[model samples]
Target: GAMAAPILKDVVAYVEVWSSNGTENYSKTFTTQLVDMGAKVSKTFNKQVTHVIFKDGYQSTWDKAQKRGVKLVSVLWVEKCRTAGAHIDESLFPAAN
Candidate 1:
């Protein structure tokens, strides 16, 4: 397995696809590019609904990600750990890396 990407300390990323309506499309193509660079991506509908999970070939995943509209593209450094320590940190992970 690859080494974990250094988690940025004391920061948070909130992608607000605010339309007052519903999420529309993935206008943020760079977000998908970040995933290909070894970052982890999870697309959510609202608060509790997550649709797709991507860590690789994320460009291909974007086609599906945009269909849902106004999606909140959450980016973070995710690693496969053998404990509960594994989590999604909003901070530390740069946007459009």
Candidate 2:
């Protein structure tokens, strides 16, 4: 069976917010809520904090919810916007692109 490998599709603005009040439990609850809404969330527990990766298209929905006063202390976004292209870290050749 000839199968194709997973490819990155449409890299867009993805934001993640951190909480000042009870960050851990807050993050955990956030992930749980996503799952409850039928979102495919990945739980990657690390040393400092729990990491969760939401499936594609989930960000839009999440952002909409955040507007309703779902406060987050920190926010982050993905750079190197890509789609069906291999990820080449900017560190290697910062000026190549």
lDDT for each residue of candidate 2 in 1-97, tens digit (9 for 90 to 100): 8644322222112224334332433345444433433233434322222222222223453454345432222211112312213433323322100
Q: Which stretches of candidate 1 lie over 4 Å from their true place?
A: 1-60, 69-76, 80-86, 90-97
Q: Which tens-of-lDDT digit does each residue in 43-89 have in candidate 1?
A: 43243323232233234345544564323233333322112234443
- Model 1 clashing residue pairs (backbone): 8-92, 11-91, 23-69, 23-70, 24-69, 24-70, 25-70
What lDDT, from 0 to 1, does candidate 2 have?
Answer: 0.30
CA lDDT of every candidate: 0.34, 0.30
- Candidate 2 ranges beyond 4 A from true positions: 1-17, 21-25, 45-97
